[PDB]
Amino acid sequence: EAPNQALLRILKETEFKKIKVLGSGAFGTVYKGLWIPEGEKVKIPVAIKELREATSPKANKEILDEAYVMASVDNPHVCRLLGICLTSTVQLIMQLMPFGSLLDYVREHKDNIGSQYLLNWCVQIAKGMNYLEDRRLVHRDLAARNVLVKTPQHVKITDFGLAKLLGAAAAEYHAEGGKVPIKWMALESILHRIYTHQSDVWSYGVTVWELMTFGSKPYDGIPASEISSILEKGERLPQPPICTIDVYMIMVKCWMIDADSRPKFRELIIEFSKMARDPQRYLVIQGDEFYRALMDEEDMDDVVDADEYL
Ligand SMILES: CCC(=O)Nc1cccc(-c2c(-c3ccc(N4CCN(C)CC4)cc3)[nH]c3ncnc(OC(C)C)c23)c1
Incomplete structure (x- = not known):
């Protein structure tokens, strides 16, 4: 099979703004926000999913597996992953x-x-x-x-x-x-x-x-x-x-x-x-x-x- 040369972008926390809460749960919390890449005159509307607990290894493996899948498929009619943030609690950054x-x-x-x-x-x-x-x-x-x-x-x-x-x-x-x-x-x-x-x-x-x-x-x-x-x-x-x-x-x-x-x-x-x-x-x-x-x-x-x- 063909090498999967998808790219996985890691984001700084300082370059996005959480504006509101769309939804919460045991899985985590989904925020509405804006992602401003440093050095680029651009602001990207995002949904930001952050884990409730930072200490569950199962939850961290699953969230990265979700990131792997989404980064490996980029297309319209598929919701896009912009990146992940490796903070105390892992964050997925997705298209709003x-x-x-x-x-x-x-x-x-x-x-x-x-x-x-x-x-x-x-x-x-x-x-x-x-x-x-x-x-x-x-x-x-x-x-x-x-x-x-x-x-x-x-x-x-x-x-x-x-x-x-x-x-x-x-x-x-x-x-x-x-x-x-x-x-x-x-x-x-x-x-x-x-x-x-x-x-x-x-x-x-x-x-x-x-x-x-x-x-x-x-x-x-x-x-x-x-x-x-x-x-x-x-x-x-x-x-x-x-x-x-x-x-x-x-x-x-x-x-x-x-x-x-x-x-x-x-x-x-x-x-x-x-x-x-x-x-x-x-x-x-x-x-x-x-x-x-x-x-x-x-x-x-x-x-x-x-x-x-x-
Ligand atoms: C539990 C599964 C789920 O998809 N949860 C969820 C919770 C809150 C918001 C979104 C969501 C939304 C979203 C969900 C609901 C609303 N509504 C609710 C109805 N209301 C009248 C207006 C606002 C607006 C946006 N848009 C997203 N885009 C990309 N990823 C998302 O979530 C990903 C990161 C998991 C989301 C999804």
Whole structure:
């Protein structure tokens, strides 16, 4: 396999500003802030994840593993790592996705979300996953909650917490016993802890169903324990009301038992691109037809998105 010559930038703490707290937890804390590289007339909006405890070796190995993965894949439609900071508590510096997770977005703006946006998001998530397949990366946790909103027009995959790089000449990843989201997993992942690009496709299909339902929960009210049996008996998620047969047939194909009978992300890109050219022909939706405050700072002249920084 090819040498992985990704670059990992180490950042000084003095060259970023934590402005606000987006979220906290036992994992750590995620700040909103600005990164000003010393000597460059540039200010980069960032999300900064800092560990709560500096003394957990397991937490430090996992955070660096996440950094390794993200640095090894740099692209649009993938949330970008800018660097890490090796302070008392390790910090990941990431590109700020101001509008949160797509799952929250469709739930808060269902009434104002049209077919054009829904299909473009589907195209974008496909381009992202097709890039990850090129990098021999298997995401293992694709879900509407793990796609974030840069702008309403532009979404990006993230939470590479469970993402695993495939070894050279290997097409499957055999995982150990661990907490994993059953409702988004392919049947072979559930029964045999097997993950591939094609199991990623299964999850893509569930992700699209979340979007097409405006944020509903798959198999709501059903224990994850009987999911395996439901899938084996041939059940699948139902057709969402706005979805023409054309769209739903794509989703269904994603949920075949034979992983090689599921589409490839390249084909999902093409097919959703076609539908994005005439969106109201494929989704029937009722009624279809400078932000310095965001950064809580006044001087925004030299602001540059990470997607333009190198
Ligand atoms: C627990 C998993 C998770 O992604 N947590 C989390 C918590 C807080 C913010 C973000 C986040 C956000 C983010 C999340 C929520 C919001 N909203 C919430 C809804 N509200 C109405 C407006 C503000 C805005 C931005 N943007 C990010 N960009 C890059 N990395 C991130 O997190 C990475 C470093 C883990 C994040 C993510």
